[PDB]
Design a protein around this nucleic acid. Structure first.
Ligand SMILES: [Mg+2]
Ligand SMILES: [Mg+2]
Ligand SMILES: [Mg+2]
Ligand SMILES: [Mg+2]
Ligand SMILES: [Mg+2]
Ligand SMILES: [Mg+2]
Ligand SMILES: [Mg+2]
Ligand SMILES: [Mg+2]
Ligand SMILES: [Mg+2]
Ligand SMILES: [Mg+2]
Ligand SMILES: [Mg+2]
Ligand SMILES: [Mg+2]
Ligand SMILES: [Mg+2]
Ligand SMILES: [Mg+2]
Ligand SMILES: [Mg+2]
Ligand SMILES: [Mg+2]
Ligand SMILES: [Mg+2]
Ligand SMILES: [Mg+2]
Ligand SMILES: [Mg+2]
Ligand SMILES: [Mg+2]
Ligand SMILES: [Mg+2]
Ligand SMILES: [Mg+2]
Ligand SMILES: [Mg+2]
Ligand SMILES: [Mg+2]
Ligand SMILES: [Mg+2]
Ligand SMILES: [Mg+2]
Ligand SMILES: [Mg+2]
Ligand SMILES: [Mg+2]
Ligand SMILES: [Mg+2]
Ligand SMILES: [Mg+2]
Ligand SMILES: [Mg+2]
Ligand SMILES: [Mg+2]
Ligand SMILES: [Mg+2]
Ligand SMILES: [Mg+2]
Ligand SMILES: [Mg+2]
Ligand SMILES: [Mg+2]
Ligand SMILES: [Mg+2]
Ligand SMILES: [Mg+2]
Ligand SMILES: [Mg+2]
Ligand SMILES: [Mg+2]
Ligand SMILES: [Mg+2]
Ligand SMILES: [Mg+2]
Ligand SMILES: [Mg+2]
Ligand SMILES: [Mg+2]
Ligand SMILES: [Mg+2]
Ligand SMILES: [Mg+2]
Ligand SMILES: [Mg+2]
Ligand SMILES: [Mg+2]
Ligand SMILES: [Mg+2]
Ligand SMILES: [Mg+2]
Ligand SMILES: [Mg+2]
Ligand SMILES: [Mg+2]
Ligand SMILES: [Mg+2]
Ligand SMILES: [Mg+2]
Ligand SMILES: [Mg+2]
Ligand SMILES: [Mg+2]
Ligand SMILES: [Mg+2]
Ligand SMILES: [Mg+2]
Ligand SMILES: [Mg+2]
Ligand SMILES: [Mg+2]
Ligand SMILES: [Mg+2]
Ligand SMILES: [Mg+2]
Ligand SMILES: [Mg+2]
Ligand SMILES: [Mg+2]
Ligand SMILES: [Mg+2]
Ligand SMILES: [Mg+2]
Ligand SMILES: [Mg+2]
Ligand SMILES: [Mg+2]
Ligand SMILES: [Mg+2]
Ligand SMILES: [Mg+2]
Ligand SMILES: [Mg+2]
Ligand SMILES: [Mg+2]
Ligand SMILES: [Mg+2]
Ligand SMILES: [Mg+2]
Ligand SMILES: [Mg+2]
Ligand SMILES: [Mg+2]
Ligand SMILES: [Mg+2]
Ligand SMILES: [Mg+2]
Ligand SMILES: [Mg+2]
Ligand SMILES: [Mg+2]
Ligand SMILES: [Mg+2]
Ligand SMILES: [Mg+2]
Ligand SMILES: [Mg+2]
Ligand SMILES: [Mg+2]
Ligand SMILES: [Mg+2]
Ligand SMILES: [Mg+2]
Ligand SMILES: [Mg+2]
Ligand SMILES: [Mg+2]
Ligand SMILES: [Mg+2]
Ligand SMILES: [Mg+2]
Ligand SMILES: [Mg+2]
Ligand SMILES: [Mg+2]
Ligand SMILES: [Mg+2]
Lengths: 210, 147
RNA sequence: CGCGACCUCAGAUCAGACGUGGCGACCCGCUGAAUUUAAGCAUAUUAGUCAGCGGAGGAGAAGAAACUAACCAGGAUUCCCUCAGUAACGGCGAGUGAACAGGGAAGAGCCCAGCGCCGAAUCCCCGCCCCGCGGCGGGGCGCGGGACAUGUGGCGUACGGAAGACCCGCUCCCCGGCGCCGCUCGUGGGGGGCCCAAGUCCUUCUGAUCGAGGCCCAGCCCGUGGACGGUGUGAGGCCGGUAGCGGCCCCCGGCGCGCCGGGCCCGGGUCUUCCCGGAGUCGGGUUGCUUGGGAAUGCAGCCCAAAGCGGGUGGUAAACUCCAUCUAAGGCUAAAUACCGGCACGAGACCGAUAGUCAACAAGUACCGUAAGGGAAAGUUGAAAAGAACUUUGAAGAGAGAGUUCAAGAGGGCGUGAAACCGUUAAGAGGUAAACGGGUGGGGUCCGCGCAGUCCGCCCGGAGGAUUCAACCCGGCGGCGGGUCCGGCCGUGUCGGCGGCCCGGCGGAUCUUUCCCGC
RNA sequence: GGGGACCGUCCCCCGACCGGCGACCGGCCGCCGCCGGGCGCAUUUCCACCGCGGCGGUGCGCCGCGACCGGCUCCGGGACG
RNA sequence: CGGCGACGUCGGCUACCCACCCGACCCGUCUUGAAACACGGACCAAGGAGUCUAACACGUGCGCGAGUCGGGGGCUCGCACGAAAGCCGCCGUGGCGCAAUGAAGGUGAAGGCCGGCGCGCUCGCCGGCCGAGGUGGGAUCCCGAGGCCUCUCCAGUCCGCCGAGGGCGCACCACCGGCCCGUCUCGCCCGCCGCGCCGGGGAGGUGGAGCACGAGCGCACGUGUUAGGACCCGAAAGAUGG
RNA sequence: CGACCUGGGUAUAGGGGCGAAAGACUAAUCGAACCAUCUAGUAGCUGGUUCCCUCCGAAGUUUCCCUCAGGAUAGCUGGC
RNA sequence: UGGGCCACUUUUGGUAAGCAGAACUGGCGCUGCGGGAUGAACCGAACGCCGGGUUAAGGCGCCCGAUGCCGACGCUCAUCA
RNA sequence: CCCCGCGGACGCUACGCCGCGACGAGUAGGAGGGCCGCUGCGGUGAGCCUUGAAGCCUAGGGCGCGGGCCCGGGUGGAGCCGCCGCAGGUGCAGAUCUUGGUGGUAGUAGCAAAUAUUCAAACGAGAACUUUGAAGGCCGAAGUGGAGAAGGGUUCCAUGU
RNA sequence: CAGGGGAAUCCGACUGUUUAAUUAAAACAAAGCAUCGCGAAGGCCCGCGGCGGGUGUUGACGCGAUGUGAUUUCUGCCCA
RNA sequence: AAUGCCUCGUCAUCUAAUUAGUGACGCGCAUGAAGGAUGAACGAGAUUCCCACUGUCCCUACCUACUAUCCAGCGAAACCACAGCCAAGGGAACGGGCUUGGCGGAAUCAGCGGGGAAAGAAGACCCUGUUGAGCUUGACUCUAGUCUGGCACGGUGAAG
RNA sequence: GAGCAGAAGGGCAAAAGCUCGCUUGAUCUUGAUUUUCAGUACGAAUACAGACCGUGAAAGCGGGGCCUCACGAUCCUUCU
RNA sequence: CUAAUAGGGAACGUGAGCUGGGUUUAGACCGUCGUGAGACAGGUUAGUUUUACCCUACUGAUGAUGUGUUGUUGCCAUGGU
C-alpha cells in the first residue's frame, strides 16, 4: 500500500529470481585465471606482440561518436591492395584483415595504408630457417633488438588539430548561424513538396498556353 | 549493524510496534500498486497526477544516439579552453581571437545562458541558439558551423 | 524358352564394425501448467517457469552477415559493464520489456554443391612381402574383388574464380625417426617414492607435564623453518611435519640442432578471353502459439506459390520513385563463457550433537506402507584397562570389605551433571487452599581478626641514637631569558636567473621550420 | 612528426633585507633548581620511643542521654489598640 | 556526657523459617468492558518469531566538490594473511549532476543606469560603465552624537565599555518585476546563394516537475514504504507426474 | 436349489473405474483414492511475537473505495 | 488509529430498555489513589522515593481511624419502621 | 621593588565539573540512554589459569532504580575474561508452540465372554500355575480331534539358562 | 428339540438387492407393458492417434436408449 | 389417503372416556389417470382393535452366576492456571476466589451423580470472508464431439 | 390571497407574471473563485477579461431557464 | 373417584439420571413450488444418546484434637423433626 509521497516503484521480482542469482565470488579467481592465460600466451608467441595483430584506424558509426576514432576488426582489402600486401600473407606477419569492410572515402583509406606502411617498416621478420636468412631481416636487427611489444600495436589515438587564434574577418562576423540553421531545416523539409508544386505549375502553364 | 535497530529495542513488547488492534497482517490493501484507481485513488491522484492514460505519439525503435546533442551555455564557454588561451587573447594587441571548438570538448549545441566577457572569440559548433549567436556577435566574435 | 545384364527387393548364427543403458550440476530440442498477483476475475501475471519426453560434451550451443546503420559509418560468435527499468508491450490495469551505438574479456577463420577443365585423376575390401605394433600406419605387388559417369578426386566458392599471354621472384612445406639436446621455463614440465635445523639443558609444579623461574657473553640454540598436528597440560627446538630457484631415485610428455626416411610442388603483378551459385524454398493469405515488436518479432500447420540488373532488409498498412545494405533456402570451427552431479584439493568473522546435511555413530540404516514412497533415535570412563584379584552373605540380581587410579563423590550408555519430580535427615509451622505487597517481631545460619576500639599533620615536654643541617667548593644535569650574544635556521616577499628542455623536472586548447627526416 | 621559444608551476643553489628563535635545534653567557662528592661534626638536621600533653582533620566497637542554634508546624498563656 | 563489653554477648541482613496487623481475585489475549461461567496455560529444560537482497524517500556522518564515482577491465613474486591492499587517467566508456519545455517537428533561460537621433512613436543603430532587478522584514557586521574613569583643576595627549540614531544587509519568507519552452489574441517590421505555402523578431494573457551566479556525486548508518517465503505458524483448494 | 455361498486366476484406475443406485465401493481414506512435487501456495481472518530505565504520547472521526472484520486520505502522535 | 463506551444537559425513534441514533463538555478506554461496603464511568483528587503538617469528598456506637461533645431545637413507634 | 617564613587544600575523563528553578500518570505508538546481557572477528590488557579455566550448586558478603554484576565456599578438570571498535541465526511464560524429561491422578481403573478344579509325589533356593500318578470335569466326530492350501520363515527337534 | 392366534388399514406384486461403520425400507431390481434409434458407408459408445476399438463368434424374434412396474381393469382432454 | 392448511373437518362405529383406528361424505389450501383404481399370496415394512398371555405396571420382594468389595502380585489413561463449603451484593447482567455476612478441625473408605456453566472437537446450526468444493441451468466466457460450406489430395468422357 | 414547467422553500407588481416586437449570450476563448472538499475531481454556480453578436432611443442587459436539483473518469470508438 | 382434584419457581429444575415419541443431518415417498439442481414453521416412514477412578456437595463408614492412660454410666449445646 502506498504511504504519503513516494515513487511508484515496479520491482521485477515476481518471477522466482532466487533460483537464478549470479554471485561474483569467483571474480578475483577469474581475474587471476585470465591474467595467467595472458602471460602464458605471451610466452608462447615469443617475440611477437603480446596483445595480438595490429588493428586499423576506424571511425565510430553514429552521430554520437563519429568524432571519435578507435581500433577496427581488420584492414580492408582495398587498404592491403594499395599497401602492396597479399591478403593471405598479411595474417601470417601479424596484420589483421577484415574482408567485409569497405572504404567509402579516401581519407580513412589513406590513413590506414600509412598505418600499414609504418607497421611494415617497424616489423622485424625472423628467417624461417635461422641458419639461412633468405629475405627476412638482417641478423643485427634481430640479435637483441627483437623484444615482445606490450599493449596494442601502435595504439589508436584521437588527434586534435590545434587552431591558431586569428583575426576575425568581416564576412565571418556577418554570417548568420541561427538563420542558416533554420533555413537549412526548412529547405530540407520543403524540398519535395516544392518540386511537386513546381511540376504541377508547369502542367497548368503548358495546358493554358496550348 | 543489527545492534543499532529497533528490533533490539522491541524485545519484550508483544506487538513489535505494529499495534494490538490492527496487527501486522500479510497484505491489507493489495500487493504492489494494487487498486491505484479504486481504494488507493486518493494517494495516486494526490502525489502522482498524470499516472493513468496515454499521451502523445509512440515511436518504435528509438535510437537515442540519433538525438544525441549535449549543450553548453555561454557562461561556461571559456572553461573549455585553458586559462592561458584566455589571458593571452585579452592582452593581445592585435584583433586575433581564439577558437573554441565545443565539439572537441564534447558539446554540439551552444546555448545562450549567462554573459560573455568582453573579448572576441570564434566559436565552432554544430548548432547555436538565437540568443547565443547574438551575444557572441555582441562581444565581437563569430559563430562558425561544423558538421 | 533357356541363358545373361541391370533395377527393385529378400534371407543368413555370412566377414568386419557400429547403436542401445547409466549419470544428468552446467548445455541443446520439444512439451508445458496451476498455485500466485491483479486486494473479485476471464485477457494479462506466475511463465515458456515446475512437472513430462528426447539428445550431448568437458564444456555445450552459437558463429563468419540475406548484419547493424543512416554515420566522417561500423563489421563472425560468445561473455561482462553500460545502454535501461529505457524504446515498446499491457483489462495502457496489475505488471512486463529488449536492441544498436560506446567500453572491455577473447579474438581465427574457412569448406562444399553448382559453373567449368583434367583419359575416374578417386575411394573401400581381401590376399602377399618388408619396416614397425600402439591409438595399427607406411612402402611395394595382385590381367585380385567391389564402389563410382544416377559423378569419386585435384583446381576453385562471392574476399570473386579460371585459362592463356607478358613481366618479376626460385624463394622451401608436412610427417614419422637416431644421437644429443638448451633440457620445459616465476625459476625441474608433470606424476610417484625417500630424506634434510635447533634443549627433552639446570632448579622446581604436577598423576603426567608441553607449566614456572634460569641459561654471563648482548644476551640457551635454530630460524629462508615461531603453519599445523601428535605426544599423560598449554611445545619453534620430543616426533611427523613447516621453509628452501633444497637433495637423491624411477616413470611419462612438448618445444631444436647434425643427420635419416617418406611424401612434397610454382607464386605474385598487368592485359585479354571466359564463368558465376543452394525451390514446395522465398514470398503472399489464413490459423494457432510466441515476442518488447506495436495494421502482425519469431515459429509452425494448411492453401497459393516465385524471380534473376533478381531476392531479402531499411521497427506504421499501401502504390510510385531514388538510395543504402547484404546475398537466404548447404557445411565446419578454438578462445573468452556455464557448472547445487563426479574425481582430487584449499579455505572460512559459518554450526557445534534438539545446532550443522536426514545422516559426526553398523544412516538412506532400524522401522512403517501392498506399493509409489516415508524415514529416525543414537558422540564423551580413564594418561594408561591399571576394567576391581582375594574374603564374605545370598540361588542369583545385588551387597559389605579389600584393591587400581590424582580421582570410581571417573565402575563399560561410565567427562561435567541443572531444573521439574522423589526419598531421607535437620529446623520451623499448620482449622479460613496455597502463594504475594508493606511493616515489624521472634528464632536460626553465617559474617565482622567485634569484644576495651581509628588514624596522622604540626607543636610542647622527657630520655635516647645517627650515611647530620644551613652556608661554601668541585662536577653532572635540567628550567627560563639573551640585542642574534654565535651558528643553524624557518615564513614572506626580493633581485642576475649564473644558474633547468645539452648543465634539474612536470605541464599548457600559447606561439613556431619561416635551421630538419612525410605532399 | 621532431627541435625550439614562451607561459604556469615546481626542485635544488649562489646572496642580501624583513618578522621569530618560535611549540625546528646546538654553543656561549646570566639567573634558578635538583643530584653526586667534599667541607661543615653539633643550641643545627633527621630517626624511632614515652606523655592516660595540646592544637587541627576524620572518626567513635555497640547502646544511649543532654544542651543551645536554625527551618517547618501544631498548640497554650499574657497584654495593647 | 553516660553505660557496656569474649567462650557469652555486640552489630548486620538484603538472605532462611515462623507469627501478627493492614493490603491483596490469575496471568497472557481479543475487547467499550476480564477475576470471569470467554479462549490458551499440569510442571521443568533446551529450541522458538521484523531477516537478508533489490529499489525508492527523507534524516544523519564522511570525502571530494561543478563535479563526482572504477563498481567492469587491466597492471602489480599469483596465492600464509592476500579472494586483501595498492595503482591506472588517451582505462571516465559510462552513470548521476551541470537545462528546461513541447505529443512532436523543434526551440532553449541578463538585465540596470546615463546620452546624443529616426518621432526617446512604449521605441529601433550605437556609445559608456556595471553585471541577475526592486519593495518590506532580516541574525551578524559598520559608523555613531552623547555618556562611563583617577586627589582636583584652565588643556590635548593613547586606546576599553554603555550608547539614541544611522548604514551595508547573509540565509530565508511574502510580494512586484524580468528571462526560457508550450498555447492563444493583436500587430508591424527585418533577413537573403535558395524570394519562399521561407526564416527571424514584438506586445498582452495563460500552461511548465523551469532560469534568475550552481550542489551534486560517491560511501556509511538510521527510519519509513514496497517486491520477494518477507515477523512466525495455519486453510478448504488448484496443477503435474506416478 | 438359487437373481445361492465361496477359493484361486484374470479385466476395468482417479474426473477415471465399477454400481439390482445408497453418491455406494474403489487397501480403516470417497460429493473425486493414495504418493511425491509445484509449495514455505494465498489468507482483509485466529494465535504468538523474547532485556532494563528515562522522555513524549494517541485513535475509534472527515472524504473516497464491490467499502461495512480492510485500506487510501485528512486529523490526532513522536522524532529531527 | 480509523469497532468505542459512559455521565450532566439538549435531543430523535420507541410503551420502555443496562435499547437504537445525534449535539456539547468531561471522563473511561490509557488511570493508580481517598470516599460511595462492593463496582471501568459517580464524588474528591490525578501519581518519582520518603518524613512532618493540613485538607478535599466522605465520615466519627462496634467492626473501623475519628463526637467517650454533660452538642442545640423539634418530628417519629412501624405485629413488612 | 612582599619576603625573619621561599610557602599555600581540591579541581577541569571540557563527552568533564559546578549552580539555580520548575517539573515526574500512561495503553497503542515513537525516541534516547544502557560501565545491561549472548556469540564471533580486528586491536589492546608484558590480562587470568593445573598453586585450578568454563560450567554448576550455595541459610555466604555485597553493589545497582533496574537490566544485571562482583566477591567467599563447594564441586569440576582446561580453557576464559576486561576495555576500544566491528558483525549477528543476539535475550522467552505463553503460540491447542517443537523436541526431551517428569508429576498429581494412583498403588487408582483395572487383570470378570466361552461350567472346574482337587489330592499326593518328584525336581528345585523357591511350586495355585512345571512334570508324574490319582480323581472330578469339558470339547462331544459340523471337536478344543487328525491332516493340508494361502501366509509365516526356522517358530520344528534336543540340550542348557 | 420346539409356530401365540384373529379382524382390518397403508405401501410394495412375489423371490431377490441396498447405504462395510447409526437408515433393510414404502427405496433399487424384477417379469409384464409402452416408446424411441438403427439395414452396417449403420445405431449407441470408447479412443491423443491409425478406416483404431466395444456391442459383434452380432443382424430387427437383434443390438442400443428411455419410462412405467406382476395379474385384472382402465389409461380421458390439450401440439398454444 | 404416506397427498386437506382450516382441522382434533362432519356423521356413524369401536371405548366409561379416543387429536388414535375403521366406514362414509367431498368445490379436493394443493387427488387423478404408464400411471389411476383394484386384488389373492408374500413382508425382520407403517398403523388400529380383539382373544390368550404375562412383573410393562399396581408394588415391589427373593434367589443364582460374574463383578463391584477386601487381600497377594501387577499396573494404566483421560484431565490438570491456581484450586476447591455457602447466602446475598456488585461485576462481561448466573462467583471457588472479590465485598458483607454465615462460618471453618488432620488422614481417610464405600457410594453417588447437584455443581466444577466437568471432559471429549479451533460449533456441523447462524452470519461474515471480495475462501472453496459437489451438483444444476434460461448466468458469463469457452471447449471435445458433431452438422455444414470452401481449398487440396482428385483423374477420363459425354448430355444438359 | 395568482402566475413564474415540475417537489418544497425563498424571491418577484408600470416585476421575475401576461401580451406583443425583434432575435439566437443555449455562440468562440484564457485564467480566477465558490459550493462538496482531502480544501482532489466531477457536476453546478459566481465575478471578471478578450472576441463576435442580439436587443433597446439609451443607460444597460444577455455568454441559457428567478435561485436552490436535473448527472458521469482512464482505455476504446466517432465527429469537428 | 375425591376433602380438593389451586396456580407456579428452581439454567422454560432435572439427558456423564433415563427415554428418544417430537424437532433437527445423511435413505425414501406424496402434495405444492422451481426449467433444473433442489426447497417447504407441509404431511409420512427408518434413523449409534459416549466418559467419573478427580475436587466439592450429599449419603453412609473408620478416625482425629483435649480430660495422664483406659473403661462404664451419663448430660445436652447444636442440627433435624
Ligand atoms: Mg508500550
Ligand atoms: Mg509474552
Ligand atoms: Mg468501484
Ligand atoms: Mg557374423
Ligand atoms: Mg486474485
Ligand atoms: Mg487476496
Ligand atoms: Mg480466488
Ligand atoms: Mg523440467
Ligand atoms: Mg544416452
Ligand atoms: Mg560446437
Ligand atoms: Mg554451429
Ligand atoms: Mg560469406
Ligand atoms: Mg538511468
Ligand atoms: Mg514474459
Ligand atoms: Mg583484448
Ligand atoms: Mg567436381
Ligand atoms: Mg599439543
Ligand atoms: Mg607444537
Ligand atoms: Mg625436527
Ligand atoms: Mg618441502
Ligand atoms: Mg514506414
Ligand atoms: Mg542432528
Ligand atoms: Mg550437550
Ligand atoms: Mg532378578
Ligand atoms: Mg573428581
Ligand atoms: Mg557422569
Ligand atoms: Mg530434600
Ligand atoms: Mg484472545
Ligand atoms: Mg463482546
Ligand atoms: Mg485478563
Ligand atoms: Mg461471569
Ligand atoms: Mg466454553
Ligand atoms: Mg478465540
Ligand atoms: Mg486447557
Ligand atoms: Mg503447552
Ligand atoms: Mg532458552
Ligand atoms: Mg584491488
Ligand atoms: Mg563521454
Ligand atoms: Mg530583500
Ligand atoms: Mg514574480
Ligand atoms: Mg516514506
Ligand atoms: Mg511464512
Ligand atoms: Mg481455480
Ligand atoms: Mg441423496
Ligand atoms: Mg501452508
Ligand atoms: Mg477481531
Ligand atoms: Mg478494526
Ligand atoms: Mg446509546
Ligand atoms: Mg482498546
Ligand atoms: Mg488521556
Ligand atoms: Mg482517574
Ligand atoms: Mg475506592
Ligand atoms: Mg452502595
Ligand atoms: Mg503525609
Ligand atoms: Mg464508614
Ligand atoms: Mg475508634
Ligand atoms: Mg412503607
Ligand atoms: Mg507531580
Ligand atoms: Mg512517565
Ligand atoms: Mg532467533
Ligand atoms: Mg519455556
Ligand atoms: Mg483395584
Ligand atoms: Mg476382576
Ligand atoms: Mg460333555
Ligand atoms: Mg484341526
Ligand atoms: Mg518347541
Ligand atoms: Mg418388497
Ligand atoms: Mg401390483
Ligand atoms: Mg446387504
Ligand atoms: Mg449401516
Ligand atoms: Mg441396520
Ligand atoms: Mg400393470
Ligand atoms: Mg422394464
Ligand atoms: Mg394423514
Ligand atoms: Mg389405543
Ligand atoms: Mg377415513
Ligand atoms: Mg395421459
Ligand atoms: Mg454463591
Ligand atoms: Mg470457530
Ligand atoms: Mg470448524
Ligand atoms: Mg468485503
Ligand atoms: Mg468455484
Ligand atoms: Mg445463454
Ligand atoms: Mg464579454
Ligand atoms: Mg440566471
Ligand atoms: Mg430445561
Ligand atoms: Mg445422554
Ligand atoms: Mg445434568
Ligand atoms: Mg425418532
Ligand atoms: Mg432425513
Ligand atoms: Mg413441475
Ligand atoms: Mg430400522
Ligand atoms: Mg431442638
Amino acid at each position: 500500500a502506498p504511504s504519503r509521497n513516494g515513487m511508484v516503484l515496479k520491482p521485477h521480482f515476481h518471477k522466482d529470481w532466487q533460483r537464478r542469482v549470479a554471485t561474483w565470488f569467483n571474480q578475483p579467481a577469474r581475474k587471476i585465471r585470465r591474467r595467467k592465460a595472458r602471460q602464458a600466451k605471451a610466452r608462447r608467441i615469443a617475440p611477437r606482440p603480446a596483445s595480438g595483430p595490429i588493428r586499423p584506424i576506424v571511425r565510430c558509426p553514429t552521430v554520437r561518436y563519429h568524432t571519435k576514432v578507435r581500433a577496427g576488426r581488420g584492414f580492408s582489402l582495398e587498404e592491403l591492395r594499395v599497401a602492396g600486401i597479399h591478403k593471405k600473407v598479411a595474417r601470417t606477419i601479424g596484420i589483421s584483415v577484415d574482408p567485409r569492410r569497405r572504404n567509402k572515402s579516401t581519407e580513412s583509406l589513406q590513413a590506414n595504408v600509412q598505418r600499414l606502411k609504418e607497421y611494415r617498416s617497424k616489423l622485424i621478420l625472423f628467417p624461417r630457417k635461422p641458419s639461412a636468412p633468405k629475405k627476412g631481416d638482417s641478423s643485427a636487427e634481430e640479435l637483441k633488438l627483437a623484444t615482445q611489444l606490450t599493449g596494442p600495436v601502435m595504439p589508436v589515438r584521437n588527434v586534435y588539430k590545434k587552431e591558431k587564434a586569428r583575426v576575425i574577418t568581416e564576412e565571418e562576423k556577418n554570417f548568420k548561424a541561427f538563420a542558416s540553421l533554420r533555413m537549412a531545416r526548412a529547405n530540407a523539409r520543403l524540398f519535395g513538396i516544392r518540386a511537386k508544386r513546381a511540376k504541377e505549375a508547369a502542367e497548368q502553364d503548358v495546358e493554358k498556353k496550348k | 549493524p543489527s545492534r543499532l535497530r529497533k528490533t533490539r529495542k522491541l524485545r519484550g513488547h508483544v506487538s513489535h510496534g505494529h499495534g494490538r488492534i490492527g496487527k501486522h497482517r500479510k497484505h491489507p490493501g493489495g500487493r504492489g500498486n494494487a487498486g491505484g484507481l479504486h481504494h488507493h485513488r486518493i494517494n495516486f491522484d494526490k502525489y502522482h497526477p498524470g499516472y493513468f492514460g496515454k499521451v502523445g505519439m509512440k515511436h518504435y525503435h528509438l535510437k537515442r544516439n540519433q538525438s544525441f546533442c549535449p549543450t553548453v551555455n555561454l557562461d561556461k564557454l571559456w572553461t573549455l579552453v585553458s586559462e592561458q588561451t584566455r589571458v593571452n587573447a585579452a592582452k593581445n594587441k592585435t584583433g586575433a581571437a581564439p577558437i573554441i571548438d565545443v565539439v572537441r570538448s564534447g558539446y554540439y549545441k551552444v546555448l545562450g545562458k549567462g554573459k560573455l566577457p568582453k573579448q572576441p572569440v570564434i566559436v565552432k559548433a554544430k548548432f547555436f541558439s538565437r540568443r547565443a549567436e547574438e551575444k557572441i556577435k555582441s562581444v565581437g566574435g563569430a559563430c562558425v558551423l561544423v558538421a
